[PDB]
Amino acid sequence: MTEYKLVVVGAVGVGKSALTIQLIQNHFVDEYDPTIEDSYRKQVVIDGETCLLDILDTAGQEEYSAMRDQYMRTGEGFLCVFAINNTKSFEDIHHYREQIKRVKDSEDVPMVLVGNKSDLPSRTVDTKQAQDLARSYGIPFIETSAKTRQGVDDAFYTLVREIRKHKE
Numbered sequence: 163m164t165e166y167k168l169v170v171v172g173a174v175g176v177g178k179s180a181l182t183i184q185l186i187q188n189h190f191v192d193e194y195d196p197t198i199e200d201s202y203r204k205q206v207v208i209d210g211e212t213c214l215l216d217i218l219d220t221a222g223q224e225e226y227s228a229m230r231d232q233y234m235r236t237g238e239g240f241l242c243v244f245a246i247n248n249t250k251s252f253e254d255i256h257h258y259r260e261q262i263k264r265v266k267d268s269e270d271v272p273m274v275l276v277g278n279k280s281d282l283p284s285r286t287v288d289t290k291q292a293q294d295l296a297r298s299y300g301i302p303f304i305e306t307s308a309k310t311r312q313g314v315d316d317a318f319y320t321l322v323r324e325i326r327k328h329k330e
């Protein structure tokens with residue numbers, strides 16, 4: 163049972179808890195709790211490899227800056243979760259990605275881009291805007307709603323595969 167550390171980083175109003183809990187105990191929480199640091203751990207069968215996935219839900223407040231470098235250095239994977247109900251958060255990803263590069267010290271990093279609330283009718287961002295951009299970076303774009311549970315496991319399995327490819 164190999165250990166995999168996945169840190170969840172997103173913006174405010176994305177509902178990261180709705181994604182994490184949906185995978186942990188398969189529960190959808192509509193409520194928005196001010197998460198500071200929530201530890202999660204789940205055992206999944208990655209294409210046959212049952213491993214231990216360590217997940218940490220961080221805060222979305224800019225107040226935590228000095229502690230940012232701390233968790234970003236121990237995180238094997240970075241779960242960039244944003245909501246397509248806001249076009250501002252789509253730009254904030256660049257700030258995070260650019261910073262992550264500074265903490266990773268490498269251009270090669272198994273990261274993907276996902277968008278929650280893809281089931282909301284207030285969708286102001288289209289998939290093309292994300293696909294075209296993701297094409298440039300060369301990163302797989304996966305759209306999964308944590309409300310209806312559409313390819314949730316698949317989105318996590320793909321990430322682990324990317325990490326394994328980097329390892330070996």
Ligand SMILES: CS(=O)(=O)Cc1nc2ccccc2[nH]1
Nearest residue numbers: 167168169216217218236237
């Ligand atoms: C039970 S735990 O070890 O606190 C959960 C966790 N999730 C993580 C993600 C990245 C790095 C360390 C991480 N630790």
